[PDB]
């Protein structure tokens, strides 16, 4: 009465759905950040101060949303295995009162 | 205020699409990985760094911010109405010159 092939999966693991996640992710801002120049066609030049605020406001939050997604797949395994050696100072950051 | 400078009609200020979309995508995108990586916590170490309580609560916050990030650019949708005195909000609240 064994059951060979019923009710298992296949390649669902070995396929690792994890790093077609994390790439996935990238994805969304990369293709967003797109978005926001076809609409700064407006007069298309170079000044933009408060542009300029909000599109490094993205950027420094990437870098935690990135280094996350590589201690995830480091310490999961399975889930991936790369590395970025490249450091920067957001990874330090600072709190004050 | 600067207003009879060369406002005359709401041209720019206000909406012009679905930007709050893009925004929020990337939490939504984000939640796929939390909940993921959830499944594979057994497999988690904790001793190379990010552990899976610290991951969790990390890529949330993370995640958050990284998404107003990109509401901070759009954060002139509200902007249009500003220009009203009936309401003022940001005007009466402010506190600058």
Avoid: C
């Avoid at chain 1, 070995?14 to 120049?37: P, V």
């Avoid at chain 1, 007069?43 to 995830?72: I, M, P, Y």
């Amino acid at each position: 009465m064994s059951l060979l092939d019923a009710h298992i999966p296949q390649l669902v693991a070995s396929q690792s759905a994890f790093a077609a996640k994390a790439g996935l992710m990238r994805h969304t801002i990369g293709q967003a950040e797109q978005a926001a120049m076809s609409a700064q066609a407006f007069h298309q030049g170079e000044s933009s101060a408060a542009f300029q605020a909000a599109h490094a406001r993205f950027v420094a939050a990437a870098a935690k949303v990135n280094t996350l997604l590589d201690v995830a797949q480091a310490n999961l395994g399975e889930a991936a295995g790369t590395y970025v050696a490249a450091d920067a100072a957001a990874a330090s950051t600072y709190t004050g009162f | 205020s600067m207003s009879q400078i060369m406002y005359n009609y709401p041209a720019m200020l206000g909406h012009a699409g679905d930007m709050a979309g893009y925004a929020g995508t990337l939490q939504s995108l984000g939640a796929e990985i939390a909940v993921e990586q959830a499944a594979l916590q057994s497999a988690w170490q904790g001793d190379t760094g990010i552990t899976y309580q610290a991951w969790q609560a990390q890529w949330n916050q993370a995640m958050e911010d990284l998404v107003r990030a990109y509401h901070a650019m759009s954060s002139t949708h509200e902007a249009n109405t500003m220009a009203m005195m009936a309401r003022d909000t940001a005007e009466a609240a402010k506190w600058g010159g």
